[PDB]
């Protein structure tokens, strides 16, 4: 879980540093560093309050430490960062869904029929897209099972009572050799 939040912090700092330097140009860099620290502290306070969902679903009241335009820009930058993560994770899943064996055998049969060129590529991407939809529906059912299991467990307890920024980790041919 540290990787996703750390990437969010890295993207958010990289955007908001330029946003703050454009916003208050006359101030020196140390003021920018302090305001970036305050902004990231407020954002991680938001995350520790209610996750990444409330950072992208509905705007809360702004803090009096920042202005309303500053909180609006922070909200839009957070939306942009989460959309970039959604697109990147979707592409990383397409990487393994295009090459999945069901899509591979359907493409093998299609090419053996004579379907080549753009039509074959289109059908490949389609079949990968219905496989992605099936697996994400399966994962949503699994997550709902987990949440309902946890809430019913918590409700039945009441009845049953009374990233290092540059470290090497050498791995070759799928063999981890990081031990001293």
């Amino acid at each position: 879980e540290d990787g996703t939040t750390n990437e969010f912090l890295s993207r958010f700092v990289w955007i908001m540093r330029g946003k703050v330097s454009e916003a208050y140009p006359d101030c020196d860099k140390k003021m920018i560093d302090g305001m970036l620290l305050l902004i990231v502290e407020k954002v991680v306070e938001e995350i520790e309050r209610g996750g990444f969902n409330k950072v992208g679903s509905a705007p809360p009241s702004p803090s009096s430490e920042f202005s309303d335009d500053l909180w609006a820009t922070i909200w839009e930058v957070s939306n942009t960062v989460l959309k970039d993560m959604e697109k990147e994770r979707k592409k990383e899943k397409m990487k393994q869904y295009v090459q999945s064996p069901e899509v591979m055998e359907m493409c093998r049969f299609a090419g053996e029929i004579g379907i080549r060129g753009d039509l074959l590529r289109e059908l490949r991407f389609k079949w990968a897209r219905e496989k992605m939809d099936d697996a994400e529906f399966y994962e949503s059912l699994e997550q709902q099972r987990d949440l309902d299991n946890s809430i019913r467990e918590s409700e039945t307890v009441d009845g049953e009572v009374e990233k290092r920024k540059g470290k090497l980790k050498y791995k070759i041919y799928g063999l981890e050799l990081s031990d001293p």
Binding site: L141, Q144, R145
Partner: protein, 168 residues
Amino acid sequence: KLLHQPLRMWRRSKTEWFHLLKTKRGCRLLLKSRFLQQLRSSMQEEDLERTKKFGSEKVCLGSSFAEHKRMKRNLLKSLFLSKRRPIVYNSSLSLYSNSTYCFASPHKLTMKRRIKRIELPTHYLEVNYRTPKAVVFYGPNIGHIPHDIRLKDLNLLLWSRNGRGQNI
């Protein structure tokens, strides 16, 4: 077709059927009758059933794969959400079972023999039966010659690559 009668009593029955064809009015009324309409509907259903020998219902499922799956997604979503805390469940089960039965039932070749139908040479002969007159406009087809010989026997003479529709 649905009147598989014994020989002697059908031969006695044919006189009454021949009297109706004596007049133009009788032929018109036989054409416009619910008897031949039921015969037509049963033959339509019978011709529909024979298509399943070619795996027609599997092509129908392959065409409609996404919405057939979406029915199961809807059923699982309802039986998760409205159950984690029943006519909907019975209706969805009946629909999914009807669809699964319609798409997965194998072809049923019955005991009753297929009726042999008169062919019309409309691929290359255009007929106006009023005079009668006809015009040739195309060439014949090797797969449409109305002989009652099986394909495996006749392949010993023709040596045809059958299945492409060509005269090969």
